[PDB]
Structures are given as structure tokens and as C-alpha cells.
């Protein structure tokens, strides 16, 4: 069932995202053809090989239309990287206004290195132009980035409460926690960077033999193999500690994210604030190199 065509009919169509500072690049699979009262489709030539390819998981043109939502993303994995691996090139957007682009089908990726805010890379969109929308056809599509956005944020724990300022005397101890979101990837991401660099000023020691408590719901994950834990005092007298993570060991626990959980004790050089900061490091967009985004807090304790 697909409505009728018209007789005022763009031969054009558009496509349109917004995402603050991110490009997405739009890759024509098929062409769309007029065809009596349908559209019917034939390969682009450019990526005509991608098909009936076993190299790509042997889709047939016809194998498209006729997939499901998840087969959909397994589809639209094998053709992005058929396009990374062919070094093809397709039609870079402008955000937020129209493209005018030709009638197709297409996959739209995120392809700039960086963006605004905190995000993480889109997923592949599989899109046609035009789209059904109720009995009609619609020639200006707007589609939506599937990415998520990551929050970190770091309290003191005192009286069984989250505080950004505490007050304490030397020699006390001062107890951090840091909650963290688990950014997701597409499924076949690589190399993904999820690190934790915490800075500690001169007037704070850093309670190495109590160390780190990393949890994820009822999870408790593993010094050495889930994370490296790297202490450097610096000369100035502050602490940077390193919490590393092998991302593909929390992946799966992204629905309650991270907590870590360490002390501190005010030492002599205490000021009369003595402040932790925490710095999250991830990767924004998993298939450009060096493509990483970063999230900071602090707090401040007082004597």
C-alpha cells in the first residue's frame, strides 16, 4: 500500500537535520524512479557493489524494503562500513536548513569529528526521500540524530548526603563520589576511550589504601581488569589520578552507568578551598580518529 503520485511532483527532494556543530553525510543507495503511479528504485552506481556482496552481508536490492527495524541497523552497519572501506564519498549537510538532494534511498551518518555539548555520535539513519507520511508523500523529510548524551557529576559524601562544598578540619577525611553516564555506541564501535582523570589540590592525600570503589547497580567491577587505577603526585603538590577503562567491560551496564567511590584526607597544607576535580574523556565519534568529547566537575572542601 503507498500513496499515488502527483502531477505537481518534485523531482527534489530534501533532507534536513539539527544538530548543533555535527555534519551528517547523506549516501544515495537507490535511485528513485517515477514508474507509472510508484516509485521504483535502481542501484546507484557508485554503491551498486555493495550488493549481492558477501563481503557485506549479500543483500538484494530487493532484500531493503522488505527488512525489519533490527535488521535495519545490522543493514545499515554493513553498508557504513562498506562506504569506510571503499573510501566512498556522498553529500555533506548543512544543520538545520534544508538539502536539497535527489529522490533515493539513503543512510545518513554523523561524520564530523566534533559537535556541541556533551552528545556522542549518531547512529546510521536509513532514510527515503520521499517518505510516506499518512495517505500522502513528503518531499522535505526531517530526521532525527539516535545519539545520547552522556552527565557526569562529582559530590562529597557527608551525613549521608551529595554536597559540592564541605568543611572539615585537618587530618579528617573527606569522601568522594563520582556518578558517571555510559555514553553507547554503535554496535560495531572500536577503540572506544572512557577515562577518568581526578585532580586533587596540595591540601588533600589521596587515600590510596581504601583506593577506588567502582560499582554499576549491584556490580562491582575489577582493578587491573576492568580499569587501571594511575596515581601521580605532582611537584606542585596536587594528585592526578588515571581511571582508565576497557570500555567494552561496562558497555553492558550503560542503564545504571558508573560510580566511583574514593577518599581523601586533609593534610597539613590544608588553606584556610581544597578542591577535587574529576574530568571524564570519551570517544565522540567512533569511527574518526581522535574524535573525543569531555566532561568536568568539581568540589570544595573548607577548614
Known amino acids: 500500500m503507498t500513496p499515488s503520485i502527483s502531477k505537481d511532483a518534485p523531482i527534489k527532494g530534501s533532507i534536513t537535520i539539527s544538530k548543533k556543530g555535527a555534519t551528517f553525510t547523506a549516501y544515495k543507495l537507490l535511485d528513485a524512479i517515477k514508474s507509472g503511479d510508484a516509485y521504483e528504485y ?20 530487493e532484500s531493503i524494503q522488505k527488512l525489519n527495524g533490527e535488521q535495519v541497523k545490522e543493514f545499515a552497519i554493513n553498508l557504513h562500513k ?14 538545520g536548513q534544508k538539502n536539497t538532494v535527489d529522490l533515493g534511498y539513503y543512510l545518513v551518518t554523523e561524520t564530523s569529528s566534533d559537535s556541541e555539548g556533551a552528545a556522542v555520535a549518531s547512529t546510521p539513519i536509513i532514510v527515503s526521500v520521499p517518505q510516506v507520511s499518512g495517505d500522502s508523500w513528503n518531499y522535505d523529510v526531517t530526521i532525527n540524530p539516535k545519539d545520547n548524551t552522556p552527565i557526569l557529576e562529582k559530590n562529597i559524601v557527608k551525613e549521608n548526603q551529595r554536597v559540592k562544598t564541605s568543611s572539615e578540619n585537618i587530618g579528617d577525611v573527606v569522601k568522594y563520589e563520582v556518578k558517571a553516564s555510559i555514553p553507547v555506541y554503535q554496535k560495531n564501535a572500536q577503540n572506544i576511550m572512557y577515562k577518568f582523570t581526578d585532580t586533587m589540590s596540595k591540601g588533600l592525600t589521596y587515600d590510596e589504601k ?20 594511575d596515581v601521580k603526585k605532582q611537584e606542585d603538590g596536587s594528585t592526578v589520578i588515571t581511571i582508565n577503562f576497557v570500555y567494552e567491560n561496562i558497555k553492558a551496564y550503560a542503564e545504571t552507568g ?18 577535587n576535580n574529576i574530568q571524564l574523556d570519551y570517544t565522540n565519534n567512533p569511527h574518526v580518529k581522535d574524535s573525543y568529547k569531555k566532561l568536568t566537575d568539581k568540589v570544595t572542601t573548607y577548614t
Open 210 to 229: 581504601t583506593g577506588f570503589k567502582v560499582t554499576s547497580g549491584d556490580k562491582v567491577f575489577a582493578k587491573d581488569t576492568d580499569y587501571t587505577v
Open 42 to 61: 535502481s542501484v546507484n552506481s557508485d554503491l551498486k557493489d555493495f550488493f549481492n556482496n558477501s563481503n557485506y552481508g549479500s543483500y538484494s536490492q
Open 258 to 275: 558508573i560510580t566511583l567511590n574514593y577518599q581523601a584526607t586533609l593534610n597539613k597544607d590544608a588553606v584556610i578551598g581544597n578542591t
Open 82 to 95: 562498506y562506504i569506510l572501506e571503499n573510501k566512498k564519498s556522498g553529500q555533506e549537510l548543512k544543520d
